Structure 1
């Protein structure tokens, strides 16, 4: 694969030269515009003179190539002119003459055509290859500048709080890509008239008069596509917004798989979501319509146009048209039509580039100056003003110099200024107004080169945690491991699948806010030249009974070391030696003292405080013809007249166009001067012109056919997913990550909706047209059948090479763009988190490598495409020479040679289209196959003769269930239980019972979750067989509680999705529970209130589902309250007793006394499962019952 092949030109245009050009251009812009500061409000009027890398070579070569190409058809006309044979009556001598008769000879013209074709193709490809190699550089430059102005300026930002991710939202991939594409496409806009005008002049010169009327039609046909563009863009935007709504709803739905997999809300939660898709589907249909129409515009106008000219042929009154006069005219028409689509694309591209550059100028001209205005002491200020950045009059009359090595902490939660003052001390905040002085020596950035900082708003790297803490220094096990073990991350030690080197942070493994603050303080610890600066890091993530432990680890770490260590915390848990304190209240620090010296000043301040206290052979070797069978699956299944109608229609239209050409040949076949006459002018209008309507009609039908098929398949494919995974087995869902499933649901549905149809249409059109042309060229000369056989056949092998080669390069590209954008994700996301960490300049060091490391692969892919195009062009030129030589040797008639040469010139260009479309289809279908293999697989059957049983909510025998006795080793690949634990429970057991870790999880999962070979045996449960309960409805009757009850969506506003028009959820079944009372009884949100992905965001009064409200099932099952307030848990227990009035039986799973302390009826267990029934807890102590529980009792 050779993912990182070579930089091979990092000096040329990677990082250094890009800045060396763009910065100088900016300097020239500012210096010149200084004279007219506001008379002319330009932005990048000097963006022309930005590089010195000329683009004039591109335009010059392009103009030369266009002239040669447009000349070619005149050579075709010459080669057809000499068809008439005027000999046997005059054979001039013309001895030794050179320029006299060198022109009209056929063979010399043919060789001229070959030379011109090769030269034009080569010049064109080389010129815009060079242009692209410059474009890439421009993109690198623009990015380098956006970073230079976003890194060392965007730290002290206060207006940016309106949109904190605006930069990483705009400049990520919408702007730079737009500018790179527009630079690579500019020559078309600059010199497309150089082709249109030239073609018009040639057509007027050789066509005469009957064609201009039929010629100027296409010059207006192109604006039809330019007009369709806007509507297509609007439809795409609407579809994108609907897709965003669908994606958010799907994320919410899929986030509760284990919760909904058995409750009464399994399928229903997707109902509207399904409609959502259908709803969104409607918008997609609208977009498809315009696209299909656009294809008709591109598939009909030429034919139509030429008919017009031939209609105006009746305005010429001539006998007929010389076959050497109109074949070349049609060739010119078929050549002119190419750059018009480029022009139409440029119509939108210019607007996109202008918008992007203006947005970039506005962003990079937004308070970026003044947001960075430039014994180890820094602070001596006599300011008449020290503004909170933009906010003036914030710190008036501030003057303080802080002796080092102190615990300076102005503890205060209200009006403290701890963040404003903390940022303004080290100069990182714009409080420099007035006069500021520093110490007599540093041992001009305001004396802060020895700073050290830790998070106040948490921050985690998008990489390994160990990387997140490496902090740009050495890394050896001794000091790092000692610091880590001072306050060990044991839960993080076991939870990370590869240690601290495993996934961590955003788009990685999650981390808690307490752990986040610990990580921040630890990365503060593993820093050198420690003169640390903190701004109250321990007011929220308080280490319970460990904040003192953390401060003692830090004691032996730095407070027993020679390094200034401070903290600006407000907590009184670690208040020992909290000597330094201030009373700012919108003022500077005017207080400083020892532990009791503050009481000397005797402020009401001290006293008051007390009162408030895998293999390559299985990937590469099987990569050849990768999607074939999957493509057959794609087309066949969901194709409404996929090939019954659309294939036949496409073939009919193509053959009809070929017959139209043959009819054009027939109309002017041989009657040229055999009959000037008056009745021979309109003979063939029923043989040639009468078919013209077919050319404008038949294709139009096919213009929708392919697209229509795709639309149907999309809905069906999407529906299949919902059909497949409406409900599923718990093993896979508890095994695989959620992100991959969400990606398979979203990205692949986008691909199948948007990109497959145009690729298929283009590939089919190219293949069929090339085949038709090959057939014609073989007809006109038998030798052509042999003559066109070998070389292209060899090309076939070469074709196969590309059919893989660039794909792998694309594969490299497919990953190459992942990291670099994340860089622009990180530095900006921490707009202030990386303010003054003494490594700001060092941020460029990695970016300037990444940019080149990616643009190198970009250029490699471009070069591969260029080589493919050149090879196709030369193969076509060879085919043209062969067919032309054969036609001129055979010399049957002018019509045959004209048709052959025109079709060869047509086929010259379609090979690149065919190859590119083949690659696109292969890659797209391979992407489809990733989720098309799991299209409808079913792994949870339901085949039971369970008779109709009423089974109301009544409790038969208090839910007596003892069905496990010496449980066997479980199976069915669903996290089996791998031991033996006989089960024998207490029927009338109200309160919960302590349990061992060995079987606590197994029992918790065993309350309702299915299993085959787990604990089968003698059973007495529920009055119906455990295995014979109906799979249609019985599983809907169960109930569970999540480990830490999280209901992300509303689940209250629309909680009456099943048949409950109870009209009592307001205050009768919920307020009495006293946990839902806060959100219901005394709340104005109402019976229709929702919280976005929150089970604990806005619902703190009842994190668990309201048990009484659901009983406005009958079996209640508990879990492990990981983050529940003990008082609230006791209140919920009182509500549980209120429910027990209707239940009087509850089983729970717990291993700690905090959840198993209130036992009223319990059992005496065996190794983790209940062994016998016994109320007394002391009896359980004598036996093996509660010894592990006794470890706290």
Structure 2
């Protein structure tokens, strides 16, 4: 990764952007490599910009009564902004005075104007100098303004992220991932471009004041007749912009909900496939889309009328100001052409530059105010720090999650080195107690006192991107001895040996590659590795078999950290026997507190806490024409509209040609009749403008195209095989469903319109002029060739850089998602600076590509203008020298050709912008082309023969040559060690992975019927519970099949009536954040209710009762006995008591299944597993 050549470049090299030549030379010939990307300049680093902005923001908060973020930004970027504004203004002033020099040159072709011919040479010299001074004043100022805006955006993003990690737990419920992703996605690219447009809000009035005084000396009092017309048009545009803003503000709210639903449904795709819910989710997403597309169409209709003002004013501005002059006395053609020349610049200043600047100010100040509102939300309170406490005391603590208190007068006291066992039923408040201790739930009454050094293990396992070792170490120094001891104590040593890459296997966001108990043990290892005074273990033995549970409890909790204070949430009696103190909760009340006796009546030596923030080759590695044609032919109405536009264009061209061939208050002589073509070219932008019979259907159809493409993209994503989906990342999916969709909906339809309009104007002018005089086309050919060649050269590297920049946005969103998912763990451990450094690295990664893209674009634009200037100089001098004692016929042709090339240049820039926008369409089509994954059930008899399962086509096999049979209506127990492959078999029944072999149900082979028919025969309870945003009723049946009577009956059977009635809207309460208001067991009951509602003959149950207490398990047992009488149930579970109600057993060991009849026969062989059975179950199994 090389140094940026901008740092050691010359003044002349920087002025002309010649330092970008090597990358353009490299990319034109062959594909860009990783080494080509340069290290970012020191000024653009996220760390430096964040410090710069944070200093001023803190001073603003500490020294003002009404702090404003705009003041903080002004004290950082004002004098460089005003510095480039002056040179932008001086380059614009040059544009207004050009007709004074060029008009006298054009007039010199007429032999009458003998005075102008005496000084033509000096006028030519002046014009040649004017072009050179103009081209050097504009582009560096625009580049500097872009650079300032990019720096401002980076600083604000850093401040937003640093605020996110401090947000209180009470305000977090109101902020979703979609709102934050919208807050970052909207300001990403447009904010940098807006800084260049902002200065015209004061440049344009001064240009109008100059131009009105210049036109006044041609037309004494008649100029105000057109000035009033332009004033009325400006008021009209100021009225249109407000309607556009109103529609945008109304639309803003639905996109966040759409984004959160889409992300939730894609990250839980396996549950959606198992339930066969794809169509329902598509229906919800398309219902959300249908609402916002109306607002999008309305805003596009308003923006069309705003955008077409420039073209539909070219004729009336000059007509209304020339007609009152021509009547009272005659007018010559020269004065009319000069009036047109000034009116072009006047119209461009009034109807194009001023409203864009005003809208840019609106958008910028609105974004800044919204970010300021984010930065002042309520914050988390940091705990008291005191190393000399060594005592955990709670007294009279009552708390509210808001009603009924979740906690009600809890008291306990534990000393250094003791173990506390917290027990209770589902929903008693065991997790809320640890939340109170951690400081995430502020008590309304009472006190909690401890040292302030804590380590936490959540009941839901959080896995961050990286390897297993990075997950366990978690941002501190690697100590080998403690690492080995902790790995050995947590029983992870066997599972790591199975992986081909051992401990360095890379895990994704969420760790879906792992099993439930593997994730639980990695989280426990992360907790244990950290040195703290208090350990909060929230039910770690939830997905573990009895033997692994016993080993971990006996060799990790009671032995490895016997000198540490620790609190264990558990229900097992054996665990309560070894506890010093026992606390039993019952509906938030202390049912019992005391000792078990009265109930029945070395590695932590070193201080490892003690990155780089810059990107290297490793970080950059991840980032590394039948698209127009495919985009057009999506919708036939677009083809019809384009044909309509073409026919009207041809009719207009024919009419204008006839009228021009056909050729008082206007004075015209034989030697001055050449002004007709000049005036026609000057006013052609109005005779060829597309009216609302052509402009509105085009935008309407262009929006319909994007609607169709979004629908296809969602459908293609939901149908892909699991092997493809596992490789995708959350941030990439969010990027492609947010940024590309927004681009296809807003920017592309109105940019294509301008490009087509400019093309039609240029082509019509060229055709009409060349028909009546063929020498103009010959003159225009070489400049067209030069522009086309330069464009072809530039796009080769521009497209690659644009693709790299588009791919660079994903890691930012991935980090944001993984940061929001694990915020409580981050604040418990204290790893905020680590994640801040990682976010800075991601920002620098994006900046490295974005800066090069902007630099090469500036280079291209400057070269195009330089080519134009050199051609103009050559033709100007040729014209001045060629004319003799009579008519100068060469100069007329040459100057008219250059007047057409002036518009051709703007058409070329519009083409470059359209090509830039089409990359998002390319990426969407790339996502659409994903490969596709693809009464009878009377008894439930199953037969399996030679079944092989594997997750990767050509990888290791998890199960090999499995064969067994199941009688109809039989309960079968599936048991085995953690990570042995119990879930793999159940996924193999549904064909969710690469499977080989044969499975028959009631004689019907699974190769006979389609996959959708096959999956509809099964009822499932996935190990990971999927809950989406919506009411209880919508979560229970997205298809809306069953009435509230049936839902209430099932909820009463499952035991959810009391839980549902707890909330304000009974069955109408909207669940947010994946059911954050529910306990862990209430989600198990929700899954049980879903399985009961769908009447199926074969049931695949994947540990239905993971974390439940023995009392709540009776609900599952009763439901199994009653609701599923004549059904084949395959019950995979670690609970020993659940094996009593089974008739056949399957044991997975050594990558194959062994079949047993009775549980006693099974247990008598594997003695070591039988020794781990608790005495309460031992008397049951051996009566």
Asked if 1:1103 is matched to 2:1087, the reply is yes
Contact 1:1067 1:1077 in 2 (8 A): yes
Instruction: Name 2:213's counterpart in structure 1.
Output: 201
- Paired with 1:1080 and 1:354, the residues of 2 have a C-alpha distance of 44
Instruction: Name 1:1117's counterpart in structure 2.
Output: 1099
Instruction: Name 2:647's counterpart in structure 1.
Output: 648
Superposition deviation, residue 750 in structure 1: 4.2
Instruction: Name 1:66's counterpart in structure 2.
Output: 92
Asked if 1:347 is matched to 2:343, the reply is no
Write out aligned runs for 1:971-1010 (5 A). Answer: 985-987=966-968, 989-992=969-972, 1004=986
- Paired with 2:836 and 2:1048, the residues of 1 have a C-alpha distance of 60
Superposition deviation, residue 299 in structure 1: 3.0
* Ranges in structure 2 where 5+ consecutive residues have no aligned partner: 1-31, 392-396, 400-413, 424-428, 584-591, 602-620, 1174-1180
Contact 2:717 2:927 in 1 (8 A): no
Instruction: Name 1:1038's counterpart in structure 2.
Output: 1017
Contact 2:386 2:451 in 1 (8 A): no
Superposition deviation, residue 927 in structure 1: 2.2
Contact 2:509 2:818 in 1 (8 A): no
Write out aligned runs for 1:941-956 (5 A). Answer: 951=935, 955=938
Contact 2:958 2:1151 in 1 (8 A): no
Post-superposition Cα deviations, 1:299-325, rounded to whole Å, max 9, x if no partner, equal 3123333332344344x433233x322
Instruction: Name 1:793's counterpart in structure 2.
Output: 785
Superposition deviation, residue 731 in structure 1: 7.0
- Paired with 2:1102 and 2:1068, the residues of 1 have a C-alpha distance of 29
The SS at the match of 2:695 is helix
Instruction: Name 2:605's counterpart in structure 1.
Output: none
> Cα gap change, 1:1130/1:777 in structure 2, threshold over 3 Å: closer, same or farther?
same
Asked if 1:810 is matched to 2:802, the reply is yes
- Paired with 1:974 and 1:766, the residues of 2 have a C-alpha distance of 55
Instruction: Name 1:292's counterpart in structure 2.
Output: 304
Post-superposition Cα deviations, 1:1115-1151, rounded to whole Å, max 9, x if no partner, equal 233333254457666654544444566x3x5253658
Instruction: Name 1:336's counterpart in structure 2.
Output: 346
Higher strand share: 2
Instruction: Name 1:589's counterpart in structure 2.
Output: none
Instruction: Name 2:142's counterpart in structure 1.
Output: 128
Instruction: Name 1:595's counterpart in structure 2.
Output: none
The SS at the match of 2:642 is coil
Instruction: Name 2:8's counterpart in structure 1.
Output: none
Instruction: Name 1:441's counterpart in structure 2.
Output: none
Instruction: Name 2:24's counterpart in structure 1.
Output: none
Give the counterpart of 2:922 among 923, 926, 932.
Answer: 926
The SS at the match of 2:1141 is coil
Instruction: Name 2:534's counterpart in structure 1.
Output: 534
> Cα gap change, 1:464/1:78 in structure 2, threshold over 3 Å: closer, same or farther?
farther
- Paired with 1:298 and 1:416, the residues of 2 have a C-alpha distance of 64
- Paired with 1:847 and 1:713, the residues of 2 have a C-alpha distance of 36
Superposition deviation, residue 867 in structure 1: 0.8
Moved more, 347-356 or 831-840: 831-840
> Cα gap change, 1:639/1:112 in structure 2, threshold over 3 Å: closer, same or farther?
same
- Paired with 2:995 and 2:45, the residues of 1 have a C-alpha distance of 63
Instruction: Name 2:233's counterpart in structure 1.
Output: 221
Contact 1:1119 1:1149 in 2 (8 A): yes
Superposition deviation, residue 139 in structure 1: 4.4
> Cα gap change, 1:365/1:696 in structure 2, threshold over 3 Å: closer, same or farther?
same
Instruction: Name 1:916's counterpart in structure 2.
Output: 913
Post-superposition Cα deviations, 1:845-881, rounded to whole Å, max 9, x if no partner, equal 6677666665454433322121111011112223434
Superposition deviation, residue 765 in structure 1: 2.6
- Paired with 1:1123 and 1:1045, the residues of 2 have a C-alpha distance of 12
Contact 1:459 1:830 in 2 (8 A): yes
Moved more, 73-82 or 770-779: 770-779
> Cα gap change, 1:497/1:207 in structure 2, threshold over 3 Å: closer, same or farther?
farther
Contact 2:420 2:567 in 1 (8 A): yes
Contact 1:1067 1:1081 in 2 (8 A): no
Instruction: Name 2:1142's counterpart in structure 1.
Output: 1159
- Paired with 1:77 and 1:972, the residues of 2 have a C-alpha distance of 74
- Paired with 1:304 and 1:239, the residues of 2 have a C-alpha distance of 37
Moved more, 712-721 or 406-415: 406-415
The SS at the match of 1:224 is helix
Asked if 1:610 is matched to 2:598, the reply is yes
The SS at the match of 2:304 is helix
- Paired with 2:162 and 2:1123, the residues of 1 have a C-alpha distance of 64
- Paired with 2:767 and 2:778, the residues of 1 have a C-alpha distance of 12
Contact 1:411 1:570 in 2 (8 A): yes
Instruction: Name 1:191's counterpart in structure 2.
Output: 203
Moved more, 12-21 or 117-126: 12-21
> Cα gap change, 1:550/1:108 in structure 2, threshold over 3 Å: closer, same or farther?
farther
Superposition deviation, residue 84 in structure 1: 2.6
- Paired with 1:669 and 1:371, the residues of 2 have a C-alpha distance of 84
Instruction: Name 1:601's counterpart in structure 2.
Output: none
Superposition deviation, residue 168 in structure 1: 5.7
Superposition deviation, residue 140 in structure 1: 4.8
The SS at the match of 1:337 is helix
The SS at the match of 1:804 is helix
- Paired with 1:28 and 1:1072, the residues of 2 have a C-alpha distance of 59
- Paired with 1:1187 and 1:313, the residues of 2 have a C-alpha distance of 110
- Paired with 2:663 and 2:111, the residues of 1 have a C-alpha distance of 20
Contact 2:463 2:511 in 1 (8 A): no
Contact 2:262 2:285 in 1 (8 A): yes
> Cα gap change, 1:129/1:648 in structure 2, threshold over 3 Å: closer, same or farther?
same
- Paired with 1:1135 and 1:1055, the residues of 2 have a C-alpha distance of 17
Post-superposition Cα deviations, 1:682-740, rounded to whole Å, max 9, x if no partner, equal xx9xx999x999849753332224213213333444555678789x5867788775957
Superposition deviation, residue 333 in structure 1: 1.9
Post-superposition Cα deviations, 1:176-203, rounded to whole Å, max 9, x if no partner, equal 9787555444422242223222222222
> Cα gap change, 1:924/1:1088 in structure 2, threshold over 3 Å: closer, same or farther?
closer
Higher helix share: 2
Instruction: Name 1:627's counterpart in structure 2.
Output: 627
> Cα gap change, 1:165/1:1066 in structure 2, threshold over 3 Å: closer, same or farther?
closer
* Ranges in structure 1 where 5+ consecutive residues have no aligned partner: 91-100, 381-385, 389-401, 437-445, 583-603, 614-619, 941-950
Contact 1:19 1:144 in 2 (8 A): yes
Superposition deviation, residue 605 in structure 1: 6.9
Instruction: Name 1:768's counterpart in structure 2.
Output: 760
Moved more, 541-550 or 1128-1137: 541-550
Moved more, 706-715 or 837-846: 837-846
The SS at the match of 1:917 is helix
Superposition deviation, residue 70 in structure 1: 0.8
Moved more, 904-913 or 512-521: 512-521
Contact 1:651 1:768 in 2 (8 A): no
User: Across the two proteins, how many residue pairs are aligned to each other?
Assistant: 1061
> Cα gap change, 1:144/1:215 in structure 2, threshold over 3 Å: closer, same or farther?
same
> Cα gap change, 1:345/1:1103 in structure 2, threshold over 3 Å: closer, same or farther?
same
Superposition deviation, residue 478 in structure 1: 4.9
Moved more, 233-242 or 508-517: 508-517
Give the counterpart of 2:1046 among 1060, 1065, 1071.
Answer: 1065
Instruction: Name 1:871's counterpart in structure 2.
Output: 863
Contact 2:946 2:997 in 1 (8 A): yes
The SS at the match of 1:475 is coil
Instruction: Name 1:1148's counterpart in structure 2.
Output: 1130
Instruction: Name 1:671's counterpart in structure 2.
Output: 668
- Paired with 2:966 and 2:747, the residues of 1 have a C-alpha distance of 59
The SS at the match of 2:486 is helix
Superposition deviation, residue 79 in structure 1: 1.2
> Cα gap change, 1:279/1:537 in structure 2, threshold over 3 Å: closer, same or farther?
same
Contact 2:1084 2:1104 in 1 (8 A): no
Superposition deviation, residue 269 in structure 1: 6.2
> Cα gap change, 1:281/1:414 in structure 2, threshold over 3 Å: closer, same or farther?
closer
Instruction: Name the TM-score, length of structure 1 as normaliser.
Output: 0.71
Asked if 1:903 is matched to 2:884, the reply is no
Write out aligned runs for 1:113-124 (5 A). Answer: 113-124=127-138
